[PDB]
Amino acid sequence: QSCVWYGECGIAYGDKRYNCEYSGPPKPLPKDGYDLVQELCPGFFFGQVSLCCDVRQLQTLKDNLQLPLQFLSRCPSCFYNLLNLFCELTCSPRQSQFLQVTATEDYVDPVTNQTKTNVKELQYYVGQSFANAMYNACRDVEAPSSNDKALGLLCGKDADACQATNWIEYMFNKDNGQAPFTITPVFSDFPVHGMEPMNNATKGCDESVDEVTAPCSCQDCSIVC
Ligand SMILES: *[C@@H]1O[C@H](CO)[C@@H](O[C@@H]2O[C@H](CO)[C@@H](O)[C@H](O)[C@H]2NC(C)=O)[C@H](O)[C@H]1NC(C)=O
Numbered sequence: 001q002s003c004v005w006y007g008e009c010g011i012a013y014g015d016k017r018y019n020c021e022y023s024g025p026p027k028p029l030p031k032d033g034y035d036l037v038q039e040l041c042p043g044f045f046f047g048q049v050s051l052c053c054d055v056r057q058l059q060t061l062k063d064n065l066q067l068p069l070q071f072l073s074r075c076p077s078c079f080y081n082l083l084n085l086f087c088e089l090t091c092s093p094r095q096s097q098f099l100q101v102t103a104t105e106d107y108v109d110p111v112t113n114q115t116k117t118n119v120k121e122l123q124y125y126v127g128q129s130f131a132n133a134m135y136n137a138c139r140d141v142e143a144p145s146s147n148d149k150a151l152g153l154l155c156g157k158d159a160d161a162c163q164a165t166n167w168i169e170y171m172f173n174k175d176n177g178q179a180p181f182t183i184t185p186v187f188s189d190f191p192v193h194g195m196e197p198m199n200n201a202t203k204g205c206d207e208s209v210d211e212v213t214a215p216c217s218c219q220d221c222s223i224v225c
């Protein structure tokens, strides 16, 4: 297994950071991060918890997920696939199979003056079926106390223009003021020049995420009506 990054490096803009380039194997997560990994990415919470992310990155992921939560929290299945998209990107011990760094710049440690490397941009190979299922689970979610679709607030365009691939492209575009750096998505259910797209299992809005979480309401999910 191999990583493309590990830990945070320099400022991109505002309070947002690039991650540090790293091409070695994943590393067992410190125990002080177990609460975060359980909350955000429980699928990775087993064995040595060897990941391509550190505690800082998990904390940042939690902070960065606030706005999707703002609009999608009422449909746990919809939010769950979105979390997994970000969990795989952030932490997967097999990152190198589906991420390709495309731009870097040097990072200088202000005290030690040792040089590290900011990952400025990368390409993310995302399963076509994954992306379609993620959209499918979220497409009927209403903005809370409204009759408009939640995706019209997370897609950089009205819901009638929002589609699976342009939703993911928008969320990953730093021009949105939220994403710390741009990720360029490539959608395929098939390998591409040796890259194996991320095609994790997904949950529909008519399914329970787990034993303690119900399916989404009829209001947010036309299947259950
Ligand atoms: C993406 O899918 C993989 C494959 O199903 C998940 O990795 C498994 O996670 C389960 C649950 O903890 C473990 O029992 C397995 O041992 C894992 N399998 C392998 C081959 O790694 C992974 O959890 C999913 N990612 C996320 C973010 O949930």
Ligand SMILES: *[C@@H]1O[C@H](CO)[C@@H](O)[C@H](O)[C@H]1NC(C)=O
Pocket: 136, 137, 138, 139, 140, 204, 205, 206, 220, 221, 222, 223
């Ligand atoms: C998702 O796809 C299913 C068919 O697999 C369909 O019944 C449903 O209309 C779609 N939308 C939602 C919100 O689940």
